[PDB]
Amino acid sequence: QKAKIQDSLYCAAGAWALALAYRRIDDDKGRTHELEHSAIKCMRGILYCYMRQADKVQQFKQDPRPTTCLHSVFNVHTGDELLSYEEYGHLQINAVSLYLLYLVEMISSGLQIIYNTDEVSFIQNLVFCVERVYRVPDFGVWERGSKYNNGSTELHSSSVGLAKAALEAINGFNLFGNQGCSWSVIFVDLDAHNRNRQTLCSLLPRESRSHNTDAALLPCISYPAFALDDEVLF
């Protein structure tokens, strides 16, 4: 019954890419729309699972701690929480950053994901939570926490890079697409992005305090993120 968020996001990416590839044909026999849906439905399911926890977002805004963080594993059949904080931690911001960046990518390519203004407000508060990534530690993408695996959290380069990319994409972007007005945009504080960049540009050669190098840095400096405008450092 467990279901991760990153895997669903990547499956939606594959479906969207296949739909885009099929878009080159005029007579699709009703196939491009199906994959475009599949992407829409995956994004909407992730959004609904996140919206089911609003008090968690409110607590994250005030005192960001692993005990007051959004869950990362939900039920695959009912969209319910499955594992408590004492067995998984659930402190993963890379999934949220990837979700925001991918939502930006799909809307820019042309899609209809966000319906009401309440969803816009929730996305804005999610961006508010993400703006303070550069101070809180996280368990990382590998959900172990560190090499020692003793339930300890530490700052990770990949997470910071993904958050910086998401903030760069969500800056001034219109969530309503072409059919949008001036009251459907997302505002981003510049000082948070500057702090994230300052925190990234100095710890980038390594992965973390306990990791000299990690394979998880590859998505941070490749296709999904592209958050390293340094060339030589890359």
């Binding site: 966000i114 319906y115 009401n116 203004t117 309503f176 059919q179 949008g180 007005c181 009251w183």
Partner: peptide, 10 residues
């Protein structure tokens, strides 16, 4: 257009 889009999406 934004109002119509919002109503249809609701």
């Amino acid at each position: 257009k934004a109002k119509a889009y919002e109503l249809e999406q609701s």
